[PDB]
Amino acid sequence: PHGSPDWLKVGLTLGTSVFLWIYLIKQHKEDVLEYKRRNGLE
Amino acid sequence: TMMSGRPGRVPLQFLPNEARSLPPPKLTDPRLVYMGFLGYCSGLIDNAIRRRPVVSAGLHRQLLYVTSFVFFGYYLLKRQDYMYALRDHDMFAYVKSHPEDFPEKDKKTYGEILEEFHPVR
Amino acid sequence: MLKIIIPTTMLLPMTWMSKHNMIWINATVHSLLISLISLSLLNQLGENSLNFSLTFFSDSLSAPLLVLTTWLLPLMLMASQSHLSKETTTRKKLYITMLILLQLFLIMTFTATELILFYILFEATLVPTLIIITRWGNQTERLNAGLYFLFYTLAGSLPLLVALVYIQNTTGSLNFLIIHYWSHPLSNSWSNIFMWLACIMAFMVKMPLYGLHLWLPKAHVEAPIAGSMVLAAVLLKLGGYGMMRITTILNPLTNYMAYPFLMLSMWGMIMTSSICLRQTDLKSLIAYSSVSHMALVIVAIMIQTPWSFMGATALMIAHGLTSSMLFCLANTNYERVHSRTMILARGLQTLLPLMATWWLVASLTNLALPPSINLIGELFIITASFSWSNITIILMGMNMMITALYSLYMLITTQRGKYTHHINNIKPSFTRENALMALHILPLLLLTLNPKMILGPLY
Amino acid sequence: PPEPTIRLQEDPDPEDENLYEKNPDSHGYDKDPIVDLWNMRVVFFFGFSIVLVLGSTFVAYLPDYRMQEWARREAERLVKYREANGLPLMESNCFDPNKIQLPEDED
Amino acid sequence: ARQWQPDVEWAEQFGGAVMYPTKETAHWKPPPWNDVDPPK
Amino acid sequence: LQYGPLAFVLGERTTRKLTETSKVITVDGNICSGKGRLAREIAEKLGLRHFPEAGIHYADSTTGDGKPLDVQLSGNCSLEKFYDDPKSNDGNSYRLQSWLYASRLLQYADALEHLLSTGQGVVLERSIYSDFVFLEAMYRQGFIRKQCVEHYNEVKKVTACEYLPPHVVVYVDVPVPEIQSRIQKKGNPHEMKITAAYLQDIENAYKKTFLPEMSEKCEVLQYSAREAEDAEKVVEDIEYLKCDKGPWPDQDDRTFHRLRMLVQNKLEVLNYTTIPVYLPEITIGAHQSDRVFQKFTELPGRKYSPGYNEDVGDKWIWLK
Amino acid sequence: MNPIIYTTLIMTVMSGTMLVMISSHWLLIWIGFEMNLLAMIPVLMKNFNPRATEAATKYFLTQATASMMLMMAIIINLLYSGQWTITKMFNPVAMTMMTMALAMKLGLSPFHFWVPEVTQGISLQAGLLLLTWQKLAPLSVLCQISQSINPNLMLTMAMLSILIGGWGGLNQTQLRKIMAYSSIAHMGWMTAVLPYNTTMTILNLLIYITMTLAMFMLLIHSSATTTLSLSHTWNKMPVITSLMMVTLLSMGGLPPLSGFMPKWMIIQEMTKNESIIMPTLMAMTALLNLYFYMRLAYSSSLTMFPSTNNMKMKWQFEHTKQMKLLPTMIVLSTLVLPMTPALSSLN
Ligand SMILES: CCCCCCCCCCCCCCCCC[C@@H](O)O[C@H](CO[C@H](O)CCCCCCCCCCCCCCC)COP(=O)(O)OCC[N+](C)(C)C
Numbered sequence A: 001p002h003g004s005p006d007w008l009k010v011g012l013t014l015g016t017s018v019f020l021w022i023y024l025i026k027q028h029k030e031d032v033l034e035y036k037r038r039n040g041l042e
Numbered sequence B: 001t002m003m004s005g006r007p008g009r010v011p012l013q014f015l016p017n018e019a020r021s022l023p024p025p026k027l028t029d030p031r032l033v034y035m036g037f038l039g040y041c042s043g044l045i046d047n048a049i050r051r052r053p054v055v056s057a058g059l060h061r062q063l064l065y066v067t068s069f070v071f072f073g074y075y076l077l078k079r080q081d082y083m084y085a086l087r088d089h090d091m092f093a094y095v096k097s098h099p100e101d102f103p104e105k106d107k108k109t110y111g112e113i114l115e116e117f118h119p120v121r
Numbered sequence C: 001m002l003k004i005i006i007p008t009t010m011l012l013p014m015t016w017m018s019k020h021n022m023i024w025i026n027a028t029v030h031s032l033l034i035s036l037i038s039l040s041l042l043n044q045l046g047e048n049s050l051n052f053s054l055t056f057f058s059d060s061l062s063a064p065l066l067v068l069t070t071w072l073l074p075l076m077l078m079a080s081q082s083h084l085s086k087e088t089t090t091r092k093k094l095y096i097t098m099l100i101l102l103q104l105f106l107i108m109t110f111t112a113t114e115l116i117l118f119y120i121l122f123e124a125t126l127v128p129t130l131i132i133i134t135r136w137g138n139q140t141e142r143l144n145a146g147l148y149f150l151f152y153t154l155a156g157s158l159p160l161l162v163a164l165v166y167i168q169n170t171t172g173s174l175n176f177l178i179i180h181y182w183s184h185p186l187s188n189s190w191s192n193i194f195m196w197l198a199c200i201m202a203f204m205v206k207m208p209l210y211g212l213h214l215w216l217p218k219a220h221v222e223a224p225i226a227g228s229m230v231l232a233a234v235l236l237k238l239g240g241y242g243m244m245r246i247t248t249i250l251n252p253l254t255n256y257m258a259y260p261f262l263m264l265s266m267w268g269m270i271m272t273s274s275i276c277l278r279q280t281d282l283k284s285l286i287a288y289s290s291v292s293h294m295a296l297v298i299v300a301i302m303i304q305t306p307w308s309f310m311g312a313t314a315l316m317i318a319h320g321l322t323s324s325m326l327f328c329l330a331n332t333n334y335e336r337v338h339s340r341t342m343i344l345a346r347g348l349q350t351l352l353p354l355m356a357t358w359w360l361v362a363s364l365t366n367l368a369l370p371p372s373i374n375l376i377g378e379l380f381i382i383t384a385s386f387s388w389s390n391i392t393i394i395l396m397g398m399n400m401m402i403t404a405l406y407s408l409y410m411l412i413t414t415q416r417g418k419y420t421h422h423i424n425n426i427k428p429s430f431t432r433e434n435a436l437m438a439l440h441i442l443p444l445l446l447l448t449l450n451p452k453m454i455l456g457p458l459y
Numbered sequence D: 001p002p003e004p005t006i007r008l009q010e011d012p013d014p015e016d017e018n019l020y021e022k023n024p025d026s027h028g029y030d031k032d033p034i035v036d037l038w039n040m041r042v043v044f045f046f047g048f049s050i051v052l053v054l055g056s057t058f059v060a061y062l063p064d065y066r067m068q069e070w071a072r073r074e075a076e077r078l079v080k081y082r083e084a085n086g087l088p089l090m091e092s093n094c095f096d097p098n099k100i101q102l103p104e105d106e107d
Numbered sequence E: 001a002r003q004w005q006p007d008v009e010w011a012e013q014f015g016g017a018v019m020y021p022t023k024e025t026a027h028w029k030p031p032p033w034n035d036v037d038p039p040k
Numbered sequence F: 001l002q003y004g005p006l007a008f009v010l011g012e013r014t015t016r017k018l019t020e021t022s023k024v025i026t027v028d029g030n031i032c033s034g035k036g037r038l039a040r041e042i043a044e045k046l047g048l049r050h051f052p053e054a055g056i057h058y059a060d061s062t063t064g065d066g067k068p069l070d071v072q073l074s075g076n077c078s079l080e081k082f083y084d085d086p087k088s089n090d091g092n093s094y095r096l097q098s099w100l101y102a103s104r105l106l107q108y109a110d111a112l113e114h115l116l117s118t119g120q121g122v123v124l125e126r127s128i129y130s131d132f133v134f135l136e137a138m139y140r141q142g143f144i145r146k147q148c149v150e151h152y153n154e155v156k157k158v159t160a161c162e163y164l165p166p167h168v169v170v171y172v173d174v175p176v177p178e179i180q181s182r183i184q185k186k187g188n189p190h191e192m193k194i195t196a197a198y199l200q201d202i203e204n205a206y207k208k209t210f211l212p213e214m215s216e217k218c219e220v221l222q223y224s225a226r227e228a229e230d231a232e233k234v235v236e237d238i239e240y241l242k243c244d245k246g247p248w249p250d251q252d253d254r255t256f257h258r259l260r261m262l263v264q265n266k267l268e269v270l271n272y273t274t275i276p277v278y279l280p281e282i283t284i285g286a287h288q289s290d291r292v293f294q295k296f297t298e299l300p301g302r303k304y305s306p307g308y309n310e311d312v313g314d315k316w317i318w319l320k
Numbered sequence G: 001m002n003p004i005i006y007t008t009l010i011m012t013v014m015s016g017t018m019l020v021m022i023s024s025h026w027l028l029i030w031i032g033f034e035m036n037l038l039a040m041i042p043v044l045m046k047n048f049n050p051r052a053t054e055a056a057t058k059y060f061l062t063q064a065t066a067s068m069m070l071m072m073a074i075i076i077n078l079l080y081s082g083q084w085t086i087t088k089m090f091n092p093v094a095m096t097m098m099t100m101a102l103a104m105k106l107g108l109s110p111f112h113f114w115v116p117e118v119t120q121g122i123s124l125q126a127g128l129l130l131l132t133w134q135k136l137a138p139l140s141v142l143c144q145i146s147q148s149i150n151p152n153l154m155l156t157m158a159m160l161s162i163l164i165g166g167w168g169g170l171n172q173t174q175l176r177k178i179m180a181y182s183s184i185a186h187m188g189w190m191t192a193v194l195p196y197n198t199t200m201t202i203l204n205l206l207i208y209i210t211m212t213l214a215m216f217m218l219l220i221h222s223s224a225t226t227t228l229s230l231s232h233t234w235n236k237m238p239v240i241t242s243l244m245m246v247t248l249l250s251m252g253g254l255p256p257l258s259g260f261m262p263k264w265m266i267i268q269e270m271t272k273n274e275s276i277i278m279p280t281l282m283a284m285t286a287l288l289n290l291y292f293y294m295r296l297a298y299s300s301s302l303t304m305f306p307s308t309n310n311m312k313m314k315w316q317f318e319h320t321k322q323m324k325l326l327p328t329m330i331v332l333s334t335l336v337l338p339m340t341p342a343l344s345s346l347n
């Protein structure tokens, strides 16, 4: 109807996406470090 | 294969500890890109159903779809790789532990092997 | 190969974000550009193949078919530009999307180093075709034609999946290189006979073989123009390509399992050539001509001699180009006449001379006139079958005579004679149709200069 | 029978629109003259000029990877060597007999 | 000059209770538009 | 937070808003009567909300802009053509009747939604009930066929088996010669072509069938032309009577919640107005439907959702 | 009904299924089945009408008979071996009777007669829940005892189910009966691979659940029950018809769509056990499902059926309620073939 951009939902969606991406990056880094530790590569 | 009853299995663990001994999938993995593409397709279909400008209706919603699909795809790929590594490990251990059932083939050369010849006429 | 697959994929976003009045221009230009890129694949070597990666490889059998597939799409767009004038933008974009998906599936099919991937794409090529036939078709029989085309193909190809997974379970790999190198003879047993039948019938139904060709006249008549050309030019060659790829593991059983199919094809060529003589429709006549030529290709493949394979490849390419041209000409006639009947419009040569020239050239090429590649493939198959048995020459000569007869009958009925009086909407032929015919015919007369490019791996 | 004899509401079948009547020099591509002309131009340029000619020359001048001249030279050298030394040209056995082992029958 | 599309006569084939009508099922009636039957 | 099961779970109970003043009232009368004037007075005096009679372009008023669309895009029928040629060959009579009935159904749904959402009552002209009298007049005069009234009856029963009949029915009675004189005085060039038999059929279809059916389950206030002028007596009669025979007392919070879910979401309200029965008067060919729908889509604020139209002037499209 | 009561009943249905899946006692599994049946009945009767009542009573009779048979099988198994744990059945008669009980619960032929009528009587929402959620408990129980089931009985019942679903789907016109016969055929497909590999059973179950959820949500979105009501849809929301046709093509097993993944994989498994005739028969039988799906697609999207005048008014109003996860369901049911190896996750 006569609806403005709901800034609350937009902010929540952006925050969720950014948090998920940061968590994925950190998890990948930790996983590769743990694998290199276990296999004695570096 | 039925690895459900495999000994020493935690009943409800998505990724056991030993699965950390394997290389994690790269973030540029083609399968992860495919999950991202699936997320984008879901976003476009969501825009189409709601009767909104398909390409550029909600950028945040499409981004959230892509991110969620990539997240689940990454974890699913890790679990898949761990399960396949388990299967190969069990295969090799069993073939080592039972030498009688997997004898070494007497290696032969094509020179001293008679194969019947069927001419084409 | 990805240098070819990726641009074909990018054709979709290119089409969907184009302006409403510029989709045809962009699609045609970039399809032609893609064809130029595909030309590089033609330079095959006498050794194994161009093994690009673990998933795609190119041979000198796949190269001509790939080039023809990439070349056909611009012609399909120019042919479809006519009857889609009064269509909404979304539906035109969907049509171009279907054509692009068909080309992409065919490109991925023709290399397909693994047989299961080949089968998956070989059946994937069936959805866009069915959508095109049943959606943008004029007659009310397009639905029945689509059902026939779907079920005739799927019933034949379903046992092929079981045969392939069984072969993988026993042999251990379905990669074509490993399959070729590790091939072993098939013993004469009932199980091996049924494996042979399962592996062969799926490709023989699509070719099509005489007795299973009922779907082809319906699919060719009721389809739009682009569907007709893609059916007659490329989709018929899938069966022959698959058969020539898969006959490497069926020896020596084929040596006596080819008799029913050889007899069926060598008699059905005569039957369909005779059928072409008494026909009240143009598209049906061209479809039956395609059936006859594909029956000859079946005979060639089942003979299994180097000259047979060379002639089969040459005939495949030549028949594809010729049938596409003939369907184009029939569609141009039907657009002005709106009837699709051979004797309703007569004496069109007095009104449209250049189209009469194109008709004459297409009929001569279909007539297997030397030194065109049509006759090259024809003659190679004739010599190979003569080596197989001296009595085949009777059937082949009868087929040649009937082919000449019905080709010149098609030319004479529609071009010569006195024009029909009560038709006064025969407008002069556009530049689009003349360009379409020229782009159809010039590659044939150019390939007659370098036959080795289309003679297959056994050259 | 007061039925209208009309089964349903339908537009009349429109008559075909001649592309020449409103626009001579129509090229049979599009009803918009400028887009139509440019479509003709790009089709003719990329079909005939770019692909059909440059591609034909490229295929004509493709490097000999099939090794035809190489095979001719090898055959020439082999024939010269075998004729000079009195060898009987082509050999009946593709593979030398000594390397091959035949299972004994003793039947 | 027009692509054929189904008319009323073509659409009435799928309007029955079941496809391929027979003698036994000729007297069957399609269910009501809303899934409510008269209280009788 | 639009109304839904969650809102009902937390706070939204519609039995609290009803304060004995709701009293949905439909004012029904013969063609060119004083009912419209009367309905306005009742709504003004009782504090209710008046809904003008639903016409051809009623639905266009509630969606997008209130400006009506083209006749081809909304209704595909005209009342003047019905008056000029009642036996029109192209089945204009039924198309007009069905479009008007469906518009009245939409208006009734909107009125019920307003009543349940706010608690303030509504006043209506001819509702979905009493609309069948025009169909009977058309059929007896021979304007429409029997299959026509059969299809109308099917649609009416399916659509009206889910709504509460109005609390009070107000009927204004005017003799046929008097309304003929009123029509002549009106001056609308098409209206003097209304035959006296048509008006007589409308009146006796009103009296013989509609009035007893409303009487057996509701309250009926039959008023003559003179006594209907004085709205004070009408309002006093409205207050004096007490509603204890209809289904309204039997309704509770749960049934009211179900009805409120039904009245909103207009697609379900109009779902059964397009049942697949192919009468030649209402059915439309595939080509005509395609062309008309395509033309409808090109309207300014109709291509996308209400809030996602760039040409109208909606901004922040890429973040909604 | 009250929204709170409806939510409570749905939670109770899910809790019964969870109790069936997470329990190691036969008595607790029977209790979970009883709780599921007890709470599932009012969901069928949410929209009160004679058809719903008749469907609910048919469902109750069938489920009660199945539960009694299951309890008798449990009793016999306990008699011949004093074990309550769900493991090897230790008795042939008990295994046979429990197989019939679980067939009755699932809907496999010749115990399939109740599915079309129950689906037809009850609403779309009720039908959607019944078609997908109900299958999870009996399938889990069958997977837990797959090492004891007799291959002959399960295989012949699966073959009969595929044949019956394919044949019965051709005649029906109402969409709910078509869905019921489709479910029967899919379960015939899915239970045939139980003796060989339960992972294929779970994968087929997931794919089928996704496909049928998408199709039922599409049918709810465009409120159509009969074929002609669906044919009218193209005039208002053509996108819905296009998506429905794509999903129908997927459900027929056409590659490269997702619906080809189970069948193919299942065939592969039965080829590893030297079973060749049966997979071929089931493929040629699934051709019938493909046929009636194609007929529905012809009626719905690929052709434009005559419309109605009143439909004009429906052009002005938008769908007020949007169901979340519909685009995800469509994408998962159409374009997930390239990720087939993920089935190694033992899903
Ligand atoms: C007088 C001269 C007469 C003969 C002229 C012949 C001209 C031939 C032009 C046509 C060429 C056909 C296309 C060939 C494409 C296949 C080869 C292509 O894939 O190679 C790519 C390279 O392609 C070129 O970089 C780009 C060529 C594309 C353009 C061709 C020229 C014509 C283009 C016309 C476009 C439109 C013109 C403007 C119109 C307005 C990638 O190479 P790469 O795999 O890394 O190589 C590895 C080996 N290395 C390391 C030794 C290189």
Ligand SMILES: CCCCCCCCCCCCCCCCC[C@@H](O)O[C@H](CO[C@H](O)CCCCCCCCCCCCCCC)COP(=O)(O)OCC[N+](C)(C)C
Residues within 6 Å of the ligand: C188, C189, C190, C193, C210, C211, C212, C260, C261
């Ligand atoms: C209709 C349009 C075309 C469709 C496709 C047509 C092609 C299908 C035809 C099948 C090809 C041949 C099938 C079997 C070939 C084997 C040779 C056999 O037929 O000859 C004799 C076999 O004897 C009898 O034929 C036994 C089979 C009889 C039953 C088969 C049905 C025959 C008629 C059915 C025709 C139906 C065809 C279409 C079905 C829809 C030889 O006896 P024997 O040397 O000891 O056994 C040889 C096999 N060994 C060595 C492995 C043991």
Ligand SMILES: CCCCCCCCCCCCCCCCC[C@@H](O)O[C@H](CO[C@H](O)CCCCCCCCCCCCCCC)COP(=O)(O)OCC[N+](C)(C)C
Residues within 6 Å of the ligand: C064, C065, C067, C068, C071, C317, C443, C446, C447, C449, C450, C454, D051, D052, D055, D056, D057, D059, D060, D061
């Ligand atoms: C209008 C009236 C007539 C006007 C025209 C007058 C001029 C007459 C000329 C017409 C024909 C006369 C014959 C002259 C032939 C000379 C050229 C010929 O010798 O070159 C051929 C070469 O031509 C090409 O090989 C043939 C063209 C390639 C075919 C590709 C088609 C173009 C792509 C379009 C898509 C294809 C669709 C189908 C896919 C399979 C043969 O090559 P080759 O003798 O060995 O040696 C070449 C040089 N070497 C030694 C360095 C190697």
Ligand SMILES: CCCCCCCCCCCCCCCCC[C@@H](O)O[C@H](CO[C@H](O)CCCCCCCCCCCCCCC)COP(=O)(O)OCC[N+](C)(C)C
Residues within 6 Å of the ligand: B004, B010, B011, B012, B013, B014, B076, G203, G206, G207, G210, G332, G333, G336, G339, G340, G341, G342, G343, G345, G346, G347
């Ligand atoms: C379309 C395909 C189906 C998609 C299904 C919906 C996808 C979204 C589901 C969200 C995640 C699912 C599970 C949530 C993670 C936590 C639960 C986890 O602990 O469960 C583990 C198990 O994880 C799940 O099983 C894996 C879920 C992954 C499902 C996807 C596989 C589909 C394969 C083909 C499609 C490829 C993916 C397409 C995009 C999703 C425990 O396993 P375990 O208790 O020890 O073994 C029980 C099974 N037994 C009894 C047979 C031995």
Ligand SMILES: CCCCCCCC/C=C\CCCCCCCC(=O)O[C@H](COC(=O)CCCCCCC/C=C/CCCCCCCC)COP(=O)(O)OCCN
Residues within 6 Å of the ligand: C152, C155, C156, C159, C162, C163, C166, C191, C192, C194, C195, C196, C197, C198, C201, C205, C212, G274, G275, G276, G277, G280
């Ligand atoms: C256009 C319509 C065309 C229809 C084509 C349908 C016919 C195709 C040919 C038969 C298809 C089924 C063949 C099975 C797939 C091959 C698998 C295989 O080779 O495995 C065999 C198994 O062989 C079989 O099981 C074959 C059984 C066939 C059952 C189905 C019969 C279908 C119809 C048969 C007659 C059709 C033949 C002519 C068809 C002409 C076209 C109409 C080996 O068995 P093992 O278990 O390994 O034994 C080894 C230890 N001794």
Ligand SMILES: Nc1ncnc2c1ncn2[C@@H]1O[C@H](COP(=O)(O)OP(=O)(O)O)[C@@H](O)[C@H]1O
Residues within 6 Å of the ligand: F030, F031, F032, F033, F034, F035, F036, F053, F079, F096, F097, F100, F101, F131, F134, F135
């Ligand atoms: N179902 C219908 N069929 C034909 N005409 C109708 C229908 N419903 C309303 N109308 C028209 O609506 C007009 C207004 O009705 P009426 O109350 O008599 O006049 P007024 O609004 O001035 O009081 C009338 O001319 C009547 O014909």
